[PDB]
Amino acid sequence: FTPANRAYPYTRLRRNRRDDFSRRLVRENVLTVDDLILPVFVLDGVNQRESIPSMPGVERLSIDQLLIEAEEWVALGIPALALFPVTPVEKKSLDAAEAYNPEGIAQRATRALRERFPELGIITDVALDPFTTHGQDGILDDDGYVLNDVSIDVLVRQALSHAEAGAQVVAPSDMMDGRIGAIREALESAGHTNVRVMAYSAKYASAYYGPFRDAVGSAGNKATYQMDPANSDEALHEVAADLAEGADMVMVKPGMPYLDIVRRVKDEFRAPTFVYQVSGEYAMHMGAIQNGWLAESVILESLTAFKRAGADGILTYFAKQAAEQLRR
């Protein structure tokens, strides 16, 4: 950055703001549907939907209903979904074995979508917290500590089962050290050459996940694996490791409360960069809009921010709404 000695009144930054045509020409960033990933909550049943108290307007969907809705998502141009199964309580355990069940919700939903919409991206969730009895993120030792390498063993089995289901992207959200490299090695050994790994690289120990926990039925803290909200430099180490270990894309989470992190990650690594606008961000915005406190326009404003900050792709519960505005 060079200021180039620009000075009022020779330089008046309002001249370009004067007319819509000059604002449109110089406009630095834009949201398009190419940027959008829709996370979806998937039920076990058939002919079912459920409303979520802390996520107004978001539904859990059984797989038949998910296929119906996906027709419109595909028509809108949304490139990918991110699947989050809502695991029945009977299928939760200490060993999280349901993670790699070829008939688990994630695996069944994946096969169904891959067959019905071959061009639609399916990003599965590599994670043990949907399958543990404690909603905790992995296998626990006697002190209640989430064991790093032993949990990865389970995540690796899960990632393989997602690849076999035909998922084009697996996205480890677990924050175990080294899991990206372990999952990549396994995929490569098993001949899953082209399965992308979307690392949750810099995923903070946040209070903004509350409504997601209600959505998935897992509703303890995670400061021993998820990042301290205070730390920024530390995020660069996380991403560097994950790129070395073979991630095809890297993600910051949560989103708008961490835009500075998005900016640094894109600037320093110049790699495909993703950001999750999490359940709490969605719920904050949607709550204020429904209360009449904010205009609908905040939705696009929030999504434009992610582009401006350097994100290539955004995981957002507003993906459908945003895509419909962009179609119009």
Minimum gap (Å) between residue 299 Cβ and its own copies: 9
Q: Does 78 engage in binding with Na ion (CB under 5 A)?
A: no
Q: Residue 93 or residue 297: which is nearer to its own copies going by CB? A: 297
Minimum gap (Å) between residue 176 Cβ and its own copies: 8
Q: Residue 30 or residue 94: which is nearer to its own copies going by CB? A: 30
Largest CA distance in the chain: 71
Q: Does 164 engage in binding with Na ion (CB under 5 A)?
A: no
Q: Are 47 and 64 in contact (CB under 8 A)?
A: yes
Residue positions in the annotated binding site? 213, 222, 238, 279, 317
Q: What are phi and psi of 46, to 5 degrees?
A: -140, 145
Q: After which residues is the chain broken (C to N over 2.5 A)?
A: 219
Among its own copies, Na ion, Mg ion, none, residue 315 binds (CB under 5-8 Å by kind): none
* Residue positions annotated with a catalytic role: 203, 253
Exposure of 60 by Cβ count < 10 A (0-12 exposed, 13-18 middle, 19+ buried)? buried
Q: Residue 103 or residue 228: which is nearer to Mg ion going by CB? A: 228
Among Na ion, its own copies, Mg ion, none, residue 248 binds (CB under 5-8 Å by kind): its own copies
Among its own copies, Na ion, Mg ion, none, residue 120 binds (CB under 5-8 Å by kind): its own copies
Q: Residue 92 or residue 280: which is nearer to its own copies going by CB? A: 280
- Tokens at 166, concatenated: 């035909």
Q: Which residue has the tokens 């709550």?
A: 287
Alpha-carbon distance 64 to 108, whole Å? 11
Q: Does 312 engage in binding with Na ion (CB under 5 A)?
A: yes
Q: Residue 98 or residue 137: which is nearer to its own copies going by CB? A: 137
DSSP code, position 137: S
- Tokens at 179, concatenated: 């899991």
Binding residues among 226-245 for Mg ion as defined by CB under 5 A: 238
DSSP code, position 254: S
Minimum gap (Å) between residue 235 Cβ and Na ion: 17
Those residues whose C-beta lies under 8 Å from the C-beta of residue 108, and which sit 6 or more positions away, are 63
Minimum gap (Å) between residue 177 Cβ and Mg ion: 5
Minimum gap (Å) between residue 207 Cβ and Na ion: 22
Minimum gap (Å) between residue 202 Cβ and Na ion: 19
Binding residues among 11-50 for Na ion as defined by CB under 5 A: 34-35
Exposure of 161 by Cβ count < 10 A (0-12 exposed, 13-18 middle, 19+ buried)? buried
Residue positions in the annotated binding site for Mg(2+)? 238
Containing 211, the helix (H) or strand (E) segment is: helix 210-216
Q: Residue 34 or residue 71: which is nearer to its own copies going by CB? A: 34
- Tokens at 43, concatenated: 């039920």
Residue positions in the annotated binding site for 5-aminolevulinate? 213, 222, 279, 317
- Return the number of other C-beta atoms located less than 10 Å from residue 253's C-beta: 24
Q: In Å, what is the CA distance from 65 to each residue of 167, 251, 320?
A: 19, 29, 16
C-alpha torsion 91→97→99→100, nearest 10: -120
> Which positions lie near Na ion, rule CB under 5 A?
34-35, 312
> Which positions lie near Mg ion, rule CB under 5 A?
238
